[PDB]
Amino acid sequence: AFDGTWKVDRNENYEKFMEKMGINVVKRKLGAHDNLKLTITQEGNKFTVKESSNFRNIDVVFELGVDFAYSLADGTELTGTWTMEGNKLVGKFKRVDNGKELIAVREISGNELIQTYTYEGVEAKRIFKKE
């Protein structure tokens, strides 16, 4: 599975995944239990994924692996690209506070949305709120 809707029901290693890139405490002020429909839409080599999280309601579209200096929710960036692998996104990276690997995946495999963002050996996931 993978298209449709998806969210971020829960969040493990999520706060510290954000933090490390430059995400200060302002997020601590209602910015963890929140966030939401990452949502996914399958396109011709792209995925207009939503991500109308608890803040910057919008959707993000990328022809599997495009480059955009988009700071992972207030940090500093996440250019490089992202992509999946049939059965699993990747988020990819090399934002700019450094040379990380957030790798905001989601993978998605049976009961899931393994957001699996492993910028440094932590990975932040829990899974969707699917919609």
- Choose among 103, 92, 115, 94: nearest CA to 38: 115
CA pair distance 18, 131, nearest whole angstrom: 24
Binding-site positions for hexadecanoate: 82, 106
- 94, burial (CB in 10 Å: exposed 0-12, middle 13-18, buried 19+): middle
What SS3 state is found at 47?
strand
Binding-site positions: 82, 106
The structural domain count of the chain equals 1
The pair phi, psi for residue 74, each rounded to 5°, is: 80, -5
Strand partners, 60: 49
Q: What's the domain range around 35?
A: 1-131
CA distances from 32 to 15, 25, 52, 122 (A): 6, 11, 14, 16
Q: How was this structure determined?
A: NMR
- Diameter of the chain measured on Cα atoms: 38
CA pair distance 19, 51, nearest whole angstrom: 19
What SS3 state is found at 75?
coil
One-letter amino acid at 84 equals M
Binding-site positions for tetradecanoate: 82, 106
- Here the CATH number for the domain that contains residue 70 is 2.40.128.20
Task: Answer yes or no: are the C-beta atoms of 117 and 102 closer than 8 Å.
Answer: yes
